[PDB]
Amino acid sequence: LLDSPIKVPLLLSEPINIIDALEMRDAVEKPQEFTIVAFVKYDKNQDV
Amino acid sequence: LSQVYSKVHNGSEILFSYFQDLVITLPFELRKHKLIDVISMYRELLKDLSKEAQEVFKAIQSLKTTEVLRNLQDLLQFIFQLIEDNIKQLKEMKFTYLINYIQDEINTIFSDYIPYVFKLLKENLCLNLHKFNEFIQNELQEAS
C-alpha cells in the first residue's frame, strides 16, 4: 500500500507507470527505502 | 438500438482494455484476478441490460400489442376459472349447519355446566376454608 507511485500532478494519463519503468517486483515483504535530507543555515559575517 | 449498443460496447471494451493494461503494469497482491472477474461480470451485466433494453423498448411502443392482448385474455380466463372454482368451493361447504351446532352446544352448556361450575366453586370454597383453618391452627400452635 505504501508502494504507490508518487509523482508531480502534471499529466492525468500515464502511458508507462513508475513501477513498470523501474521493473521491480514488489510484495508485502519488500521494505521500500525513503530518505529525505534538508539542510539550511543562515550564514552571518563574523566581522560585525 | 443495435448500432448504439455496439458503439457503447466497443467503447466499454476499449476502456476495460486500457484499465487492465494499467493494472498489469502496477503491482498487486492477489486482486488482479478479482479485478478481471469484476470486469467480466460487468461486461455480462452490460450485455444482459442491452438485450433486455432492446426488447422492452420494442414492447413499450405499442408494437407487440397482439401478444399483450392474448396474454391478458388468457389471464382473465384464468381468473374467471379461479373465481368459479372458489364459488363452487363456497357452495360445497355451507355455514347454516354450524349455527345449529353452536346453538345446541350453548344450550347444553347453559343447561349442564352451570351447576358443575357451582359445584366446583363450593368444593374450592370448602378446600380453602379447611386450608385456612389448618394454617391458623399451625400459627396458633407456633405462637403457643
> What gyration radius of chain A follows from the Cα positions, in whole Å?
19 Å
- Please give the number of β-strands of chain A: 0
**Count, helices of chain A:** 1
Distance between the termini of chain A: 54 Å
Q: Which range does the strand content of chain A fall in?
A: under 5%
Task: Let me know the largest β-sheet of chain A.
Answer: none
Description:
Chain B: Glycans are attached at residue 10. The structure is cut from a larger assembly and holds two copies of chain A. Chain A has 48 residues and is mostly loops. Helices cover 10% and strands 0% of the residues of chain A. Chain A is built from one helix and no strands. Chain A has one helix at residues 18-22. The A-B interface holds A 3, 5, 14, 16-17, 19-20, 25-28 and B 22, 25-27, 29.
